[PDB]
Swiss-Prot record:
Site description Histone H4K5ac H4K8ac and histone H4K5bu H4K8bu binding, residues in chain: 32, 85
Official protein name in the record: Bromodomain-containing protein 9
Subunit structure, as described in the record: Binds acetylated histones H3 and H4. Binds butyrylated histone H4. Component of the multiprotein chromatin-remodeling subcomplex SWI/SNF called GBAF, which includes at least BICRA or BICRAL (mutually exclusive), BRD9, SS18, the core BAF subunits, SMARCA2/BRM, SMARCA4/BRG1/BAF190A, ACTL6A/BAF53, SMARCC1/BAF155, and SMARCD1/BAF60A. Interacts (via N-terminal bromodomain) with acetylated RAD54. Interacts (via C-terminus) with RAD51.
Domain Bromo as annotated: residue spans: 1-101
Compartment(s) of residence: Nucleus
Function: Plays a role in chromatin remodeling and regulation of transcription. Acts as a chromatin reader that recognizes and binds acylated histones: binds histones that are acetylated and/or butyrylated. Component of SWI/SNF chromatin remodeling subcomplex GBAF that carries out key enzymatic activities, changing chromatin structure by altering DNA-histone contacts within a nucleosome in an ATP-dependent manner. Also orchestrates the RAD51-RAD54 complex formation and thereby plays a role in homologous recombination (HR).
Protein's organism: Homo sapiens
Residue numbers of the full-length protein present here: 138 to 238 of 597
Region (Histone H4K5ac H4K8ac and histone H4K5bu H4K8bu binding) location: 77-79
């Protein structure tokens, strides 16, 4: 269980806590979101991100953040602004990028 794996697990646990209803837990289906797959070309979700951590597919924080951004951007593309999914995507995006900022990562660097 590599250091990066342990770190991303931690970030992921913190992010999933801001989604109590599990809207980002698993892939959005066409059954619950009509036409979704005709609009979103690269679906992403916490579940898929988890699997990639376990399989050791992320080489950096950068690559993990990219998948996280893809997830929020997908929500803000398919959904209209005045929806719960759009608003939660924005909120979580901002809190994710604050948690995983260059400046916080640097402070951590300096104390190791």
């Amino acid at each position: 269980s590599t250091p990066i794996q342990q770190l991303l697990e931690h970030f992921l646990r913190q992010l999933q806590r801001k989604d109590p209803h599990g809207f980002f837990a698993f892939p959005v289906t066409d059954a619950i979101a009509p036409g979704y797959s005709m609009i979103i070309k690269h679906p992403m979700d916490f579940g898929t991100m988890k699997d990639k951590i376990v399989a050791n597919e992320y080489k950096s924080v950068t690559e993990f953040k990219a998948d996280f951004k893809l997830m929020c951007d997908n929500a803000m593309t398919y959904n209209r602004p005045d929806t719960v999914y759009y608003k939660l995507a924005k909120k979580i995006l901002h809190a994710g990028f604050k948690m995983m900022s260059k400046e916080r990562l640097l402070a951590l660097k300096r104390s190791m």
